[PDB]
Tab-separated table of C-alpha atoms in Angstrom:
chain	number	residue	atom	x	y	z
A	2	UNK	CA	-3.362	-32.054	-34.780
A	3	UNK	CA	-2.939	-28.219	-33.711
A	4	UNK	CA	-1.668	-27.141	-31.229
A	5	UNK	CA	-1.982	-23.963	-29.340
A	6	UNK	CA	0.729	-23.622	-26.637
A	7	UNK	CA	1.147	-21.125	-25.085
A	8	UNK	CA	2.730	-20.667	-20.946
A	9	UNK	CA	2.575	-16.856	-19.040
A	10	UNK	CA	6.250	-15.620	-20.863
A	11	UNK	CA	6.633	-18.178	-23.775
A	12	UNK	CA	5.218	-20.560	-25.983
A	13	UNK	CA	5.742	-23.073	-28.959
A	14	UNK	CA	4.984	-23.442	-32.370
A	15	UNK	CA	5.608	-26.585	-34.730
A	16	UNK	CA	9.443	-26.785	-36.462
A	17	UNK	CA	9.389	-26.021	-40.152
A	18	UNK	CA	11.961	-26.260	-42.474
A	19	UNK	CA	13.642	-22.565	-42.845
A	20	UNK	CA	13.826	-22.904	-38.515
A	21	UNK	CA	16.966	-25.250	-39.359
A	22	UNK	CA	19.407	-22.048	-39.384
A	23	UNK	CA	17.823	-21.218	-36.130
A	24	UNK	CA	18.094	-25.043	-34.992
A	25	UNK	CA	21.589	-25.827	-36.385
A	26	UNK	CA	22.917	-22.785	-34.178
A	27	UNK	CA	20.939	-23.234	-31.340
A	28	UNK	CA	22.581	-26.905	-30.987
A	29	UNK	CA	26.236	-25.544	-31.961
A	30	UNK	CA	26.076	-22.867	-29.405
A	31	UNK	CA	24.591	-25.243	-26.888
A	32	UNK	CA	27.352	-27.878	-27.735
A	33	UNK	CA	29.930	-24.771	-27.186
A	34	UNK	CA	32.511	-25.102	-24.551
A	35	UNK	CA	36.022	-25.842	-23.755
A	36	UNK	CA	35.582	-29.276	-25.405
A	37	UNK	CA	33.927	-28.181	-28.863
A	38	UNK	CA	34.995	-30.907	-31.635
A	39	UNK	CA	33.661	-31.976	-35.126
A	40	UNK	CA	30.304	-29.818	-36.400
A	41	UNK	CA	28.005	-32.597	-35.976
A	42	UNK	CA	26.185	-31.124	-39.183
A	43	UNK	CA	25.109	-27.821	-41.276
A	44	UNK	CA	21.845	-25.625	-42.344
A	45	UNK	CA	20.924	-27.901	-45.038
A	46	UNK	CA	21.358	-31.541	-43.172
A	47	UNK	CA	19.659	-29.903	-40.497
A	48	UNK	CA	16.588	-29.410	-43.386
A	49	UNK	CA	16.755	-32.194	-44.089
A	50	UNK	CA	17.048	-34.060	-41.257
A	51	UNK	CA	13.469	-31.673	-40.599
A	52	UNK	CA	12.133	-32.415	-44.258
A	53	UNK	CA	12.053	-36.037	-42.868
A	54	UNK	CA	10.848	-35.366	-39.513
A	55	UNK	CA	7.485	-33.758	-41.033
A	56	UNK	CA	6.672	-37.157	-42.507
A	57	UNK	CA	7.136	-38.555	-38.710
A	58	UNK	CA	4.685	-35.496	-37.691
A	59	UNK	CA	2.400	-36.395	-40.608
A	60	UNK	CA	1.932	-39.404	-39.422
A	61	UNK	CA	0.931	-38.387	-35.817
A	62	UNK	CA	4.510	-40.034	-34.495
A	63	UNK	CA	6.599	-37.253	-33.524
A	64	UNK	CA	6.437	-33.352	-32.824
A	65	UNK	CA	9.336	-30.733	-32.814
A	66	UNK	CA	8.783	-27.747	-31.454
A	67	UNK	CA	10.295	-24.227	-31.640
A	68	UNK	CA	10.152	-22.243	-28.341
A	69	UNK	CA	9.498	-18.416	-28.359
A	70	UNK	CA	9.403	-15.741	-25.731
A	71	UNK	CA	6.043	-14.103	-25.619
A	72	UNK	CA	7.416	-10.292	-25.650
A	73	UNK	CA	8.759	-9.981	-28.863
A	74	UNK	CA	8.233	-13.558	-30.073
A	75	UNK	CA	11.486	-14.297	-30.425
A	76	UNK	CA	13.556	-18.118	-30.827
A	77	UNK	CA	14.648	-19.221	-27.473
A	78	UNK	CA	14.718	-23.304	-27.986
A	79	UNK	CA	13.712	-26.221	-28.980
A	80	UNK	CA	11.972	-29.059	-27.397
A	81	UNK	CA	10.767	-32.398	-29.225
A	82	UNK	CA	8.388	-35.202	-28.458
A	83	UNK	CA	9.061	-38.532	-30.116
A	84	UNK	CA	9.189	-42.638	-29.613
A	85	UNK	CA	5.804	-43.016	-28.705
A	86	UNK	CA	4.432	-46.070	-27.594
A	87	UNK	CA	0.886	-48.503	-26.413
A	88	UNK	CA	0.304	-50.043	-23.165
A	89	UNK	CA	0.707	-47.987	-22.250
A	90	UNK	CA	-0.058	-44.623	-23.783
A	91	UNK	CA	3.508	-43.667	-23.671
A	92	UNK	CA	5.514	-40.218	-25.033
A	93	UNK	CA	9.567	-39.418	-24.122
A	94	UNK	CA	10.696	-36.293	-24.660
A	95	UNK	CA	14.027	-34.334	-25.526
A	96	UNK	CA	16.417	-32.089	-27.572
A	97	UNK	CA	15.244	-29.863	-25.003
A	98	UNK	CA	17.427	-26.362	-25.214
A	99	UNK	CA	17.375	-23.086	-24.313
A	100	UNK	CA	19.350	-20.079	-25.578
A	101	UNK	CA	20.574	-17.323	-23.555
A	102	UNK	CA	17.858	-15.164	-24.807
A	103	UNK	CA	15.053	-17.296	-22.662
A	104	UNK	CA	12.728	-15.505	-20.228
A	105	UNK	CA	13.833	-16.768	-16.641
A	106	UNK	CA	10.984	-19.083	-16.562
A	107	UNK	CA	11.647	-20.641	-20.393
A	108	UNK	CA	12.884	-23.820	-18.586
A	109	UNK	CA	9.954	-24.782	-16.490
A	110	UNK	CA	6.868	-23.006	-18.547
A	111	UNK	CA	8.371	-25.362	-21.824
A	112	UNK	CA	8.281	-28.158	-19.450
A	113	UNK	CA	4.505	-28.064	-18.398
A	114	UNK	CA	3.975	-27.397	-22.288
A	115	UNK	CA	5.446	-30.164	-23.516
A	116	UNK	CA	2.987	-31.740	-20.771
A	117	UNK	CA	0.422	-30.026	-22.105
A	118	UNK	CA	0.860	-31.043	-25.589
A	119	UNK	CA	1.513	-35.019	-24.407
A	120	UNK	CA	-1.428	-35.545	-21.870
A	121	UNK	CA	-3.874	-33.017	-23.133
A	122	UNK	CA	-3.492	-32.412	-26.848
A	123	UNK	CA	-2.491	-35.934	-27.785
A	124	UNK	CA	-4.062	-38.156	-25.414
A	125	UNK	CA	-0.978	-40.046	-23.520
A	126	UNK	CA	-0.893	-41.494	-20.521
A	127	UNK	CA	2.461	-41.075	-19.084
A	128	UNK	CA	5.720	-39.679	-20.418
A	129	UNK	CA	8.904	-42.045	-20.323
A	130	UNK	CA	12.511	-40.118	-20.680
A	131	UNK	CA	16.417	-40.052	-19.983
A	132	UNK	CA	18.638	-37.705	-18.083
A	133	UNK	CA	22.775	-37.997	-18.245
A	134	UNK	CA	24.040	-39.187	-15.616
A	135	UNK	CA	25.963	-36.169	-13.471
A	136	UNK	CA	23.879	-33.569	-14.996
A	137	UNK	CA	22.355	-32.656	-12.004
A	138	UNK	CA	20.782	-29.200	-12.351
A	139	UNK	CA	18.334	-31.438	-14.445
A	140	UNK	CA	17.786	-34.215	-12.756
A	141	UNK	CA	16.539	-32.113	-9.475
A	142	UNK	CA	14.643	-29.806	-11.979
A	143	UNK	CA	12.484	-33.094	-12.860
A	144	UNK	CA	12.042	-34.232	-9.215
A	145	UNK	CA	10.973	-31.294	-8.302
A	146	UNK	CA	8.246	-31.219	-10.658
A	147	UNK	CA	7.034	-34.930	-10.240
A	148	UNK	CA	8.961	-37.345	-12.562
A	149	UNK	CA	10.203	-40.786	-10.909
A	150	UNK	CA	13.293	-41.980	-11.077
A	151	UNK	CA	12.356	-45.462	-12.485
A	152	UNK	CA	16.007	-47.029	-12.995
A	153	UNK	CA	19.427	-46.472	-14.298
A	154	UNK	CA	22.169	-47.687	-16.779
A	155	UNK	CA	25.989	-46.693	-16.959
A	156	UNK	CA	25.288	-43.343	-18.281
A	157	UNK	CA	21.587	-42.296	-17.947
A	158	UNK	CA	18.806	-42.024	-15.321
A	159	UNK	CA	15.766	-42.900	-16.810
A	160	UNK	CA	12.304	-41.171	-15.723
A	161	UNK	CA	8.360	-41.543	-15.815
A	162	UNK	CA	6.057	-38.930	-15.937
A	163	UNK	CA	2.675	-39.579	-14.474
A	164	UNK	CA	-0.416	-37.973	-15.611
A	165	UNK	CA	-1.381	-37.800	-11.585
A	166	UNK	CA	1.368	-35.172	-11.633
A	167	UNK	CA	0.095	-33.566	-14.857
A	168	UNK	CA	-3.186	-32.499	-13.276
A	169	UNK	CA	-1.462	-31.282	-10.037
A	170	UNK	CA	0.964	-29.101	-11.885
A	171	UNK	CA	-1.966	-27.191	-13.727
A	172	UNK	CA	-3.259	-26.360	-10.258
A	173	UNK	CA	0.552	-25.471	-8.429
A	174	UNK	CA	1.937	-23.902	-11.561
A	175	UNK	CA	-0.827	-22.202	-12.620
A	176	UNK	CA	1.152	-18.625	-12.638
A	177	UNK	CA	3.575	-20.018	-14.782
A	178	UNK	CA	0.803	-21.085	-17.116
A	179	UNK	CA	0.410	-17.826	-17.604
């Protein structure tokens, strides 16, 4: 599979191997607050943990992506799709961040890519995924573009993505699309 995603101010390209500096800072910084506690790992477990991701991606059963800004094609994020499933046709998605070098769209125009990627590239059917519970600058980002709140646990809100709302989105966020 190639893919060739690309949004009006940013776009992705596969994770390789030397992104894991990129990666392993990306998720300390976004970690980084008040609370910051054990390094949950380092460059090299972070290549490797990507070493054995490509035979996942090999295998057509998982795809990490690096997100760029268009301008000067620069690393702004990551996003990932993964646990993929039949009957149906089923993707989630996640390790979704974005650095403070994003474009001010980065957030929704790597959104309708990943959707891009899911529905049109790959063939699903819907896209199944989790939200924290209390993180609610998310949760209203995904209403807001279509996802239904399907049911909840202790600490998560869990979402479907309908290909209905796929199509729609190409037509309402077609600026963003670029």
């Amino acid at each position: 599979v190639n893919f060739n995603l690309k949004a009006n101010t940013t776009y992705l390209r596969l994770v390789e191997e030397n992104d894991a500096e990129f990666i392993c800072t990306l998720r300390n910084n976004d970690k980084l607050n008040t609370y910051i506690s054990k390094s949950t790992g380092d460059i090299k477990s972070q290549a490797e943990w990507i070493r054995n991701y490509k035979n996942r991606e090999n295998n057509g059963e998982e795809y990490y992506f690096i997100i760029f800004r268009s301008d000067d094609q620069s690393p702004i994020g990551t996003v990932r799709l993964y646990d993929f499933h039949e009957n149906p046709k089923s993707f989630c998605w996640g390790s979704w961040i974005l650095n403070e070098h994003k474009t001010k769209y980065a957030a929704v125009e790597s959104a309708l890519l990943v959707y891009e990627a899911g529905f049109s590239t790959l063939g699903f059917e819907q896209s199944h995924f989790e939200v924290m519970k209390g993180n609610d600058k998310v949760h209203s980002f995904h209403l807001k573009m279509g996802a239904q709140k399907i049911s909840e646990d202790d600490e998560n809100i869990y979402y479907i993505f309908p290909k209905s709302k796929y199509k729609e989105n190409k037509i309402q966020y077609a600026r963003f699309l670029g």
